Symmetry: D2
């Protein structure tokens, strides 16, 4: 049973030899969305859709292990926006892709199923290794990157994010991490940091690695110490990791939040310059087809007062349409606007005179390649960047967890215990954990 696996992981006296020899259960507990139910939301608006009515907790058969892959006993995961989007079947259900992609080969076909096991983060222990897997073995304490790339095309051989056959694990693949067991490629695997618990270790993955590419990597903004970095939604999932990269890299974050409580979160992170966009009442759109340059100017005036007359070197974009005109306007001459999302709307509108005449640059970014994910996770291992857990749910209550994220109820990360019976487990370096406890817990 799975309980044998849980007890074997927990016990201090267990070997790599031991963990290999335990038999796989016939099925495991999984968070699921169903294919027969994809029409369930019938003429409802998006915000009017409830993940609690579409999410199931099923017993599901263990998948066949292929070459290059790994079966992992999952202690914890988190809720990501992609997970929520899949719950609602928005813009469409995830079964479309799983079906079309399943046609390519028999290995691809494993994913084409009446249910979809979701989740794109994980922290656990490797149970089985596939053939051709050498860097990892059973018993290894791991977290997982969510990029699944095949690399048959040559397009990704100078940055795997350009691979045309890429898949986001647990979104465009089945067997995601919101379950007691998961199937991932071994080149998704990263070592779990010693000083964190399972759910803390699971919390950064997708979001932190995305922030890393966007802001720190040379494929993104390429931040340098001293830069003024404008960070929209600074207390949210993405923003919370971005703010930390800015601070830890010796740059100056200009945190934009929507409340005094969110502002206090950024001050705790260490940010000095904070704009509450709700208190200042910036209306970058007059009506939703006309923008207000006056408001862009007013906002840039506020930034200049906080920086002592400096503009923004790098804007960390993600709200999109509502905000994107201001972002382009406020950036310094020669500076960079970096974007990984458009949550308020994907039809961006900006004045190009401010872009071309001031030699600025808009850089698109999406997730992270494995080297980038490694590096970001490594910075978590070193205690430079910290997990941003605000609330932990049990696997039982992922439905509620997904609703909570859907209505933006919590700051930072929302995490899910999977196999872990209680919070706070899986800490190996008690000394280092104590050195950073205050920071690890800032969101809680």
């Amino acid at each position: 049973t799975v309980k044998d696996i849980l007890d074997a992981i927990q016990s201090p006296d267990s070997t790599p030899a031991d963990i290999a020899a335990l038999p796989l259960p016939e099925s495991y507990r999984a968070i699921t969305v169903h294919k027969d139910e994809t029409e369930m939301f019938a003429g409802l608006e998006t915000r009017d859709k409830d993940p609690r009515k579409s999410i199931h907790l099923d017993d599901v058969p263990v998948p066949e292990l292929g070459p290059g892959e790994a079966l992992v006993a999952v202690m914890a995961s988190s809720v990501n926006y992609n997970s929520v989007h899949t719950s609602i079947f928005e813009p469409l259900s995830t079964f479309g892709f799983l079906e079309r992609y399943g046609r390519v080969s028999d290995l691809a076909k494993r994913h084409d199923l009446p249910y979809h096991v979701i989740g794109s983060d994980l922290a656990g222990v490797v149970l089985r290794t596939g053939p051709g897997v050498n860097a990892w073995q059973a018993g290894d304490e791991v977290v997982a990157h969510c990029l699944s790339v095949e690399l048959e095309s040559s397009d990704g051989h100078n940055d795997t994010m350009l691979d045309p056959e890429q898949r986001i694990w647990g979104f465009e693949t089945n067997f995601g991490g919101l379950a007691e067991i998961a199937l991932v490629k071994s080149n998704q695997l990263m070592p779990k940091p010693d000083h964190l618990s399972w759910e803390e270790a699971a919390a950064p993955g997708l979001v932190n690695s995305t922030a890393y590419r966007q802001l720190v990597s040379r494929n993104g903004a390429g931040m340098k110490q001293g830069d003024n970095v404008l960070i929209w939604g600074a207390s949210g999932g993405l923003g919370s990791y971005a703010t930390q990269f800015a601070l830890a890299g010796g740059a100056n974050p200009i945190c934009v939040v929507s409340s005094p409580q969110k502002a206090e979160i950024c001050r705790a992170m260490g940010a000095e310059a904070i704009i509450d966009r709700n208190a200042e009442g910036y209306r970058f759109w007059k009506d939703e087809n006309t923008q207000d340059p006056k408001e862009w100017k007013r906002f840039g005036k506020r930034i200049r007062e906080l920086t002592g007359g400096e503009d923004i070197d790098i804007v960390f974009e993600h709200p999109g349409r509502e905000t994107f005109g201001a972002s382009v306007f406020v950036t310094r001459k020669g500076g960079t606007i970096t974007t990984c999302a458009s949550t308020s709307g994907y039809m961006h509108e900006y004045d190009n005179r401010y872009l071309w005449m001031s030699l600025k640059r808009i850089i698109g970014s999406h997730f992270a390649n494995y080297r980038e994910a490694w590096e970001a996770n490594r910075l978590i291992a070193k205690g430079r960047i910290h997990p941003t857990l605000s609330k932990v749910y049990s696997l039982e209550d992922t439905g509620q967890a997904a609703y909570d994220v859907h209505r933006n109820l919590h700051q930072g990360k929302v995490g899910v215990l999977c196999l872990a019976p209680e919070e706070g487990l899986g800490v190996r370096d008690r000394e280092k954990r104590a050195q950073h406890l205050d920071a690890i817990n800032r969101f809680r």
Copy 2:
């Protein structure tokens, strides 16, 4: 005193040397194409396209300005009409006298530009007459072209790429003493060597337009093109497009030329392009509605591109029409590709679908004129005969008003040239063998 005629005489006589030009005294006045502070409101309540530059353009006799440190007075043999010269001609968006006036507060030397008249023009080919204090790289008698960037670099901002200087000025636009005249005043760090195999007007043709395309497409500050790239070029036979297309070809890349007519298409074929789209014949309506873009039209355009490339997307979009085409440019670029912009002629409020940008790791790079190193390299490529001037039409100085009109109303393809001091076309070639090597290419736009 010494007239401009005496200077011509001495330029054109066979064995006149650098010694003889240096010895000539400065003339006291010169003929210059001008706009008057008097007349900035003469274009009333009229649409832009109904403003006639010929009403505002004067040919004046103007005094020679004081030659300052780090500067050169040049006898201008030829020049060209640029869009910026046309915008100054009508008074759009505002007249140029506002900036001359404000910048004129900054120093005694800056105040020289603050005049009741504005000598316009941002290109030149001619002969250095006299050199101000501290100028060493140039001397009287040198045959030169000019770049249009003037920088002070008092600020630290432009010390890693000079286009970042906040005190920059476009010569002939945000400075006075421009090149549509018999004499010009420039910084010595605007001067580049005149190509020997070209006549004066041909050497003055590429200037501003060629150096802009270079930075945008070739330079690492822009797109940083590579041989084998597919480069989508909007307006490919127009002034800017005509240089962009040549850079893509000379650099081993594959231009995908967009044009608006079959005669324009033939111009691209003459330059050596094979992948050509007549966007009017195909009837692209990227905007169904003044407020609404049509993604089916983006998709149809991308399909046409892929037929021409054999299934490949655009590595680099060379943008400049702006609002109308910008959504389409973002859509059709390859995953990890670049959209480079230096203008928005159809409208500066760009709208695009950011999903295509972030999800496929695309980049929009803003570009503007060229720093002087980029301008030197661009001009050097003309001197090498890798890239050719694209003159379609040449006017005399007296007829610059007509030239400005011709450009305002988009009458010609390529460049519109102006003879200044030069009494006729085709003068000033020193390397006739290299010229015969490239003559067909040099005359492609005639």
Copy 3:
């Protein structure tokens, strides 16, 4: 079922991919080999006098087991590279040491740990069978291969594949090379054959062309601009003969260095005009074994400036190493690049750091190409912008002599080898395009 039986099926249109894959693997295939028994054989001798004709065997060998990610290719043609010659003379040590030790990693790695070594690091041929999880390639596909074998289990190579710590060079650090009737490669080595070229022409560029691409054209190398003055050592050599074409196709200005008038003429045939015959000029950059001559640096720099009209070099395309590196550094422009992929004259470089830091220059190390770089390099061949540079072709049984030829640096450009191909000039699929580029294709012949 023989290779002749394999060959006849290939050249038939009805032969389905599932049917070319239905063909049972022959007992054996013919293969160019080095024997572990024999690594000793040249002890005592100067490198110069070691004769690959004495160590190269043509053996009948079995087909290796096919794994995940891999393909078996019926090899119509290959080429001789310096790495194949090195192995054939067992220098600096033999290839067997690595084959053994790396064999320890997995059951699949052990397949290579054999008493013989099938050599060769280029190919052109037809896919015979694909292993588990290969989707982009299938039996019957007409392919060339790049020689980079990467595992990609480490994160190191996921922002540029040349950074993978577990890399091997196919046919040198792997067994089952391309100088043979059948080869085993990863499917991520496969690229489509240029239609307008014959098998041996299509095999010719791989290793060296892709190397030149990365070093000179790629942003991971020098990232050449049109207009750049590019100094190319050994410009009619195998590597130099592709670097020169990239400079020209890319609208740059190669300054070609050659060591003979015949080599100069070949550079003029490619389209180069600025040529320095370093031999006729008698450059002696080293006064003796331990002392450099900066006067000779300067003299060489003056000659460069005579050719460019007073301009220094934007990018030096280095590979001779010790003999030339001091001069390469000296003649580079302020802010310029020296790019290096080899050190044929000796790997201990000595240079004056004053010329490098005070003029803000860069030395950039490059090695082979990642798959995208290689795919792009091969695409430029396919478009007819870059041409193969065969000077000489040998049959499979004469690979010993071919190897000897390259060892002795006898020919210019590339030396090719017909493997399964029964004669020269077969395998062109676009005859009009070939007639367009024929004179260019045959320059080195």
Copy 4:
């Protein structure tokens, strides 16, 4: 007329406007540290280490130079000793006068610098006295420090990064009127604002060295450091290394400091460095003798690094010792990593194994001083209190000889400072609250 005391006092009084300070009569002479054209052969036949700067340095009374366009005259409160100041003391490799003579031929203003004496010094902190024509960024009364780069930028070479300008000069070394003096002449594009929380001597300390480290390590023209990098810093408690180490730490990177004593190691620990190698305690001998290197020592060194990093290699090597160390530097750096070099203090004939460079895709990047944007950014980091000055010792102006001697002999860690007009240490701080925050960091080297 007025003496220097009278300006010093006039500066200090609060009813002095900029216009007042500017209206102040210049003195007939000012005190300046100098070297004499008379005496360039003084050290003939002596080994470098036996050459004594106290023997060649004079304290002279010197006339104020003519003020030119784009320039400022500065009352210098403090300066510092740099290696280049020391090299000019001992006239190695050749005296400075040669360059000063040759460049004097350029213009009348260039000729100002061509004198029988050379006022030395490439750092300063002080007060703007007088501003030349065209200067708008700065005015009399302004509290300033100086970057040591003077560029003309008449050539195009330097318009995408001014360190490529062929007419560059290092101020105080290739120019006269250096900063070891009571008055200095600089270009206004050398001036940066002085950090409020720092004393004059503290503000003068970073200048040349800090901006060098910045270009080399932080800038995209150098290694382009990121957070998480392993950075090997040779001579970590030295001038250059004292800033390099702070950049690595303040940018979230991991310095591996190489020092030559447990005392030097203690200072690295006070900076915040965790990984420290004492090359003396370990006894690395990278060379067996003068013509043969020892790779066994490279590997041994490599192993020690790997112990401190936990199995990781070096992303970025911060080089400057050169010959002794370069082989090891190239060996220890990670696949795809960078060696960045700005000097070769043990010898400029570098020998390294190219196999490690090409097979592992490594880069050697050369770097030299800083462009003005870089220097501005370096000094801004000091001002924001992210980076601190590393003064260990301070001399008065009359003891500059002794100061150059000490530096020549490598007696001190960090920076050696020099008071010029300041009558005592610790003057000139305006923000005592920021100072209090950073005091222990500021005095770490004392």
